């Protein structure tokens, strides 16, 4: 379920969220009874958007950006509070990123990618590009996405995930293949087969850009490629970005 009428959440989207909780949680109705209209709920602090001294190295800034993203918390409610239309102009998506920082609600992988671009537009020596995954577990397909980053010729990632090892990577990987193979290993450890990796182009640092994000500049079928060709195609995508 996706909130499609912005904030505050309209009456219909709100009931739907609480209907969904009623079916998913064993005590679903008791959860709604305890929370809905409760006058003794914790006040959640609005997390502070991190701002950076020009003396702070980019890797340290990325740590603060990831901490901010984590502080919003992974959205387990079953209702996404922000609609992300992936084909929208960057300027529209960065308007959404700003509203995410002002309203400060839980988020999932795609929202974290938009936030990551927004909070690193101040870092022109950092290149940002989305990396999407399609995985298989127990007869079902799963989709995930992170923000690949490149600083000083080394690859890292920002993002939001259920699992610690499927989001943040410090920019220490010497090649793009070493970064993506670390994700593939993490998936292998939680018994997922990696089927496809989709790699985007460098995103503009201009938050008023009318350009779209290119999400699928490279689509790599891991199984059809095999080990060697998969590394070659990842390295080819790394060169394409460095030269453009």
């Amino acid at each position: 379920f996706v909130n499609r009428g912005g904030l505050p959440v309209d009456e219909a989207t709100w009931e739907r969220m609480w209907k969904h909780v009623a079916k998913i949680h064993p005590d679903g109705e008791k959860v709604a009874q305890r929370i809905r209209g409760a006058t003794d709920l914790p006040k959640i602090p609005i997390p502070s958007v991190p701002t950076f001294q020009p003396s702070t190295p980019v890797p340290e800034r990325l740590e603060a950006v990831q901490r901010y993203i984590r502080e919003l918390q992974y959205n387990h409610t079953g209702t996404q509070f922000f609609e992300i239309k992936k084909s929208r102009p960057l300027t529209g998506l960065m308007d959404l990123a700003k509203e995410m920082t002002k309203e400060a609600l839980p988020i999932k992988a795609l929202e974290a990618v938009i936030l990551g671009i927004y909070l690193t537009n101040s870092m022109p020596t950092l290149e940002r590009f989305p990396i999407s995954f399609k995985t298989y577990f127990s007869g079902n397909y799963f989709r995930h996405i992170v923000l690949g980053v490149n600083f000083a010729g080394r690859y890292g990632a920002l993002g939001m995930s259920r699992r610690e090892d499927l989001m943040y990577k410090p920019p220490a990987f010497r090649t793009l293949s070493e970064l993506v193979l670390d994700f593939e290993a993490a998936y292998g450890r939680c018994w997922h087969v990696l089927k496809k990796v989709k790699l985007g182009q460098s995103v503009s640092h201009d938050p008023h850009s009318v350009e779209q994000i290119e999400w699928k500049h490279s689509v790599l079928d891991v199984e059809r490629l095999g080990r060697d060709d998969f590394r070659k195609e990842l390295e080819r995508h790394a060169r394409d970005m460095r030269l453009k």
Binding site: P8, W14, M17, P42, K43, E103
Partner: peptide, 28 residues
């Protein structure tokens, strides 16, 4: 503001809910 009070009330219920559902998903 009525709209602000509404977002504050909703935000507090969203995080109380998110804690409960995080604890649920934590015990698959």
């Amino acid at each position: 503001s009525a709209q602000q009070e509404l977002k504050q009330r909703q935000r507090a219920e969203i995080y109380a809910l998110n804690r409960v559902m995080t604890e649920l998903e934590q015990q698959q």
